[PDB]
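To assess whether the prediction recovers the assembly geometry, we first specified each molecular entity separately, as shown.
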Amino acid sequence: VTYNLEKRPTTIVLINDTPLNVLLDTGADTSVLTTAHYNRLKYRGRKYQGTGIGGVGGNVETFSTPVTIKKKGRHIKTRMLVADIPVTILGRDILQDLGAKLVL
Amino acid sequence: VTYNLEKRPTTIVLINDTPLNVLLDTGADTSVLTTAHYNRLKYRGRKYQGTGIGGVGGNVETFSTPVTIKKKGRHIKTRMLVADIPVTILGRDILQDLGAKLVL
Ligand SMILES: CC[C@H](NC(=O)C[C@H](O)[C@H](CC(C)C)NC(=O)[C@@H](NC(=O)[C@H](Cc1cccc2ccccc12)NC(C)=O)C(C)C)C(=O)N[C@@H](Cc1cccc2ccccc12)C(N)=O
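The predicted structure of the complete assembly is given in tokenized form:
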């Protein structure tokens, strides 16, 4: 599917068997699940301490956690960061894995 | 051109006749020039007070300024926000104008 950017590009993905609406963000180097979302997952793996991320408002502490993402018939097994951010974002690391491309 | 997201999707655009490397960010609702970049523009228009933007680290104050952007043979005349952020970002407002699309 093609997102023309009239609205924020969001889609539902299954993370640890829980359908979540996520933002597809080419400006995010890495993917981050909101703490609220991490707490609603049907299954959770261990929490590994992380070393933060930065954005427009400064830096925020993170932890990392193992997840399985299902979308586009792919089963991706990776680590995602967790942080108190406003929305769950799929960044370049997972976007590359799913085959997403930005065309200008 | 197609960005496969192995690296941050950046490109050079001319803003007020000044070539700048900008980040193409589908996660940004609106475009923001860094203060450093605004100060290096060959030409600058008036500054209009704005009402901030938010991101991962909280909110940051902004002002808006009229600009002309040239890229892909288009001449776009619009307003961009200015703020002390780490990089200049072209968000959905300008991305839509240039015809960019994200494909998943
Ligand atoms: C972890 C992600 C980080 N990237 C980023 O923060 C860049 C990424 O596009 C982010 C997603 C947004 C969703 C947090 N975008 C923004 O912050 C943009 N905000 C908006 O559009 C808001 C959206 C927004 C705000 C509030 C609530 C929202 C609820 C739902 C949806 C959107 C929401 N609208 C407004 C009107 O306030 C700004 C750029 C215009 C990142 O890649 N960090 C890097 C490198 C880095 C370090 C320091 C500062 C950076 C600043 C920008 C990009 C990268 C930066 C890293 N390695 O840590």
